[PDB]
Each structure stands twice: as C-alpha cells, then as structure tokens.
From TrEMBL, chain A:
<protein>
    <submittedName>
        <fullName>CRISPR-associated small subunit protein (Type III-D)</fullName>
    </submittedName>
</protein>
From TrEMBL, chain B:
<protein>
    <submittedName>
        <fullName>CRISPR-associated Cas7 paralog (Type III-D)</fullName>
    </submittedName>
</protein>
RNA sequence: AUUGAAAGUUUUUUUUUUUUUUUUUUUUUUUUUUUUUUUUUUUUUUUU
C-alpha cells in the first residue's frame, strides 16, 4: 500500500551522495522536514510538486527520488499526500538512525520485506 | 509587529581580498531588507505594574527599569535584526497611547489613557 | 489558474537564445530575480510593466515572452502579481536545474502536463 | 405419569467531581560591489 511506496521512496532517497567526502544519504532530514512543513503551511498539492521539483533542480534531491515523488503525488488527495509524506519521513528517520547500508537495502521493494530484513539482523 | 508601508530592498555586499586589493573572492552575498521607514503595529501588555501612578516602594526599581527601557526605545531606539553592526536594524517608537485598566472599578473600560511621552 | 500561466510564460522564456556560443536560455535567472526585487521594492504594477517593457526592448527577453507577461500583468493586484512572479521564478528554476530540453516542452500549456513530462 | 407440583434472583443506583502541557530561549557572528580602459583620430577661416 502507501507504506510500500514510502519505503521505495526512502530507499531511493537514502542512496549515497557522490562527490561528498563523508558517508551520507543523497538527501537530508532537513529536506524531509521542509517538505512536510511546506505541505502543512500551503495546504496545496501542486505547490508541493513545485517545491519537490525545485529541490530536485537544486542538485540536492536525487532525480529518481524526485520522479518517484512526482509519480506518487499526482491525482492524490491532500490527506493521502500527508500520510505518504509522514510514512516517508518515518522510514527515512529509521534508516538513518539504524545506519542501514544502502547496498544491502536497495534490493527490497516491499515494506514487509524491509521489516523482515530489520528483524532478522 | 506587522508592517503596512513596507518595501523590501536587496543589498549585495562582497569582500575585498587584502592582498591584491579589489578582487572579489566570490563571497558575494545578497541580503533582503525592509525600507528605511515603515510603520509597525506595536502592542505590549504589562500586568501588576502601575506606570501612570507607579508603585510606592514595593518591588520598585522595576517600574524604573521599564521606564528607562521605554525612554531608550522612544528617543534612541534599540538595535534589532540580523546584521545590527553595520547599522542594519534600528527600530523606534514614535508615539503610543498608554491605556491603564484597573480591575476593581472597571477593567474593560480604560481608567486613564495618556500618550507615552508624558509617561516618561 | 495562475500556475498554468506561470508554466506557459516560463516555457516561452526557456527558448534557446539565438546566436549564442553555447545552448543557453534566452532569459536568465538574474532577470527573473530582478523582476521580483523590483516588484517588491516599488510595490506597484505600472512601473513593473514599464521595467518589463524596457528589459524586453533591451534584449534578454523574448518578444512573445514579454507579450505574455504584459497580457498576464495587464490588470492584476499586487498580491496576485507577486504570487505569479514567484511561481514563474520557481518554474524557471526547476527547468534550468533539470536541464529540460526546450523541444520536449513546446506543447505544454498547463502545469499538470509539465509535471507528467518531468515525472516520466 | 419421578413422594411432586409452581414460581425470572428479580427488581432500583450515570464511574462522577477537582487540573490551561505550562515558564524560560533575539536565526546572529564575520565579508569595502572592486579591477584593468586617455572621450581619441581625420579637417589650412576660408575665393570671381
């Protein structure tokens, strides 16, 4: 469901950022918090899409992650968009806190698969 | 304090390398500002501190401190803002009606209303 | 909606600059930021249109782009004007950062079509 | 056709009152819009 979309988006956004001297994901938690705050303040989905596009164009959001976000957040209700963004934020925070390597986590496309991976080890 | 007759002005400042004076080392930063002169809606509430009449001696020197702060704000004006060292940001209170509301007689109806200049 | 107009004008402004050594937009982001700053500083639509016309006469603005901007801002309130200008600036920034090719966005008239094109 | 039987464990009672997620916390500290460029060259105050 929405959780699978959120997990795929978080995995795409957690890929290592090239030309960065320190190991870190391509995006930052500040970007996700800004996304949520902008959606809450503006209460519009098209404005959120514009924000996502500009963040992608600022060379700080992975183009694949941006494409996934735009694909998910079209013909979608505001409440559904809010829920999806919250799920994305929570999954990203979990992955950051657990320091999950992107190499062994990029191969999962289901939330249940991610849960199994985390539970096993 | 929101503004009414505001105007946003952008100023661009760049640094000068001390060796080979004049070169811009790429530290070109542009900042947004407000116009020099624009009204702001100021409103402040003070409780249990009579100013028009003042307190005799109980927990005093607080009324004096508040009056000193108000006098500095009115005549000189305090410095607030982001730069605050190159002169960016100097607010000032031009005039303000001081309305006193006392609980026993009439709290909704103002008791004494005076201009801030007479208070200080 | 305002966003459709913004997308159309940004598309008109992202046309390649004729007679240029490198493939670059005919209109630069500095011009858009200058438009925003001028509107914020002056806080009126008439001299904003005057500045737009002067820039268009002094190159750097496509004739059709200037015509679309003038038609859009012919009769608009200050808040609506600044909203439209902000939308235009954001759309142009997205197009520039994404390095989207002009030939693939010559037929878009709405914002949803552009979003679909970008997503795909 | 049990020694032999025919009776609702039922009525009745509000889990209610007292309590502000509150006080304190300035998105500021630093950076000269300078820098190389001669308003220059051509022209007889002059004939029947």
């Amino acid at each position: 469901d929405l959780l699978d979309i959120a997990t795929r988006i978080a995995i795409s956004a957690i890929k290592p950022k090239p030309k960065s001297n320190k190991p870190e994901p391509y995006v930052d938690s500040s970007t996700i918090n800004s996304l949520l705050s902008f959606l809450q303040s503006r209460r519009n989905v098209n404005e959120l899409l514009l924000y996502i596009m500009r963040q992608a164009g600022r060379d700080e959001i992975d183009e694949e992650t941006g494409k996934l976000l735009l694909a998910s957040l079209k013909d979608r209700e505001l409440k559904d968009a809010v829920n999806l963004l919250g799920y994305v934020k929570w999954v990203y925070d979990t992955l950051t806190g657990l320091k999950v390597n992107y190499n062994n986590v990029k191969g999962v496309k289901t939330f249940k698969e991610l849960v199994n991976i985390l539970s096993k080890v | 304090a929101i503004a009414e007759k505001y105007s946003i002005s952008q100023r661009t400042m760049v640094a000068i390398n001390r060796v080979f004076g004049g070169q811009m080392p790429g530290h070109l930063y542009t900042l947004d500002y407000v116009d020099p002169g624009s009204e702001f809606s100021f409103m402040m509430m003070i409780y249990n501190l009579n100013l028009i009449e003042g307190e005799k001696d109980w927990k005093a020197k607080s009324v004096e401190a508040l009056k000193f702060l108000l006098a500095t704000l009115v005549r000189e004006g305090i410095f607030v803002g982001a730069r605050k060292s190159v002169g960016y940001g100097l607010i000032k209170l031009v005039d303000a009606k001081v309305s006193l509301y006392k609980a026993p007689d009439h709290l909704v109806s103002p008791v004494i209303v005076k201009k801030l200049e007479e208070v200080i």
